[PDB]
């Protein structure tokens, strides 16, 4: 039951998200047979890196570094929203909730989950990008001109402390699900059936952590505190974006992201 639910969540988590934490840590610890990721630390290494990905993927693109990076960020975020949506629909009970509530949960859940999964791709020195084939240094990101130089920093700060807890993909699968099924999102119509799903997810999470992190009794408690922390990180990310939105006349926000940000905080 609870062990069965943890297994089901792990399997769809693996199906919904290509680059897993296990895979990410192997790349970052050189514990991989693959070619090391190309490192990006300045103007010229960014250009070199882009040369290489011109042979892997593919209308408008700025010649200003910070805006171009932020545009690349937007498209990755859009692709994360899709993945997170397919994941949520795999959570037993979710798709049977009122549609307006489903939309609300994703609207408020999506960024919290993004910063959670981003942690997996980070260490204190930088972040993996493009499916793990590149690595952008933290310091290079801190150097970007305002207001973009401070865009990734709080996300690194979160991840450094979060990664200290050593969750693996199976823990993360349930943790994410608990976050999505929060009955205290603003504007929910039917709180009860959401809490009823979260209750069982919470139980599965507690059990999973007791079994796999036996040395850290009270890891459950510490995880629960992170879920709330994330709420304020998003809140402050959203304030940063309204600044960018108003003062950066060049770039245009992506429509899906506008949808999520609108009337949010």
């Amino acid at each position: 039951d609870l062990r069965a639910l943890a297994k089901h969540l792990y399997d769809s988590y693996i199906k919904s998200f290509p680059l897993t934490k296990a895979k990410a840590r192997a790349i970052l610890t050189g514990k991989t047979t693959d070619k090391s990721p190309f490192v990006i630390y300045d103007m010229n290494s960014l250009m070199m890196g882009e040369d290489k990905i011109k042979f892997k993927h593919i209308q408008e693109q700025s010649k200003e570094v910070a805006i171009r990076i932020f545009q690349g960020c937007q498209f990755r975020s859009v692709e994360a929203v899709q993945e997170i949506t397919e994941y949520a629909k795999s959570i037993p009970g979710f798709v049977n909730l009122d549609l307006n509530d489903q939309v609300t949960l994703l609207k408020y859940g999506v960024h919290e989950i993004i910063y959670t999964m981003l942690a997996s791709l980070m260490n204190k020195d930088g972040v993996l990008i493009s499916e793990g084939q590149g690595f952008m240094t933290r310091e290079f990101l801190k150097s970007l001109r305002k207001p973009f130089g401070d865009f990734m920093e709080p996300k690194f700060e979160f991840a450094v402390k979060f990664n200290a807890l050593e969750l693996d993909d199976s823990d993360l699968a349930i943790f994410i699900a608990v976050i999505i099924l929060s009955g205290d999102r603003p504007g929910l119509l039917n709180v009860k059936p959401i809490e009823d799903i979260q209750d069982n997810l919470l139980q599965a999470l507690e059990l999973q952590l007791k079994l796999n992190h036996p040395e850290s009794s009270q890891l459950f408690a510490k995880l629960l505190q992170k879920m709330t922390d994330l709420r304020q990180i998003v809140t402050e990310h959203v304030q940063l974006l309204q600044v960018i939105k108003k003062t950066e006349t060049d770039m245009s926000l992506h429509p899906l992201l506008q949808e999520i940000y609108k009337d949010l905080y």
């Binding site: 939309v103 994703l106 429509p255 899906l256 949808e259």
Partner: peptide, 8 residues
């Protein structure tokens, strides 16, 4: 939330 609704 047009796009979100469609995703859902």
């Amino acid at each position: 939330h047009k796009i979100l609704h469609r995703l859902l």
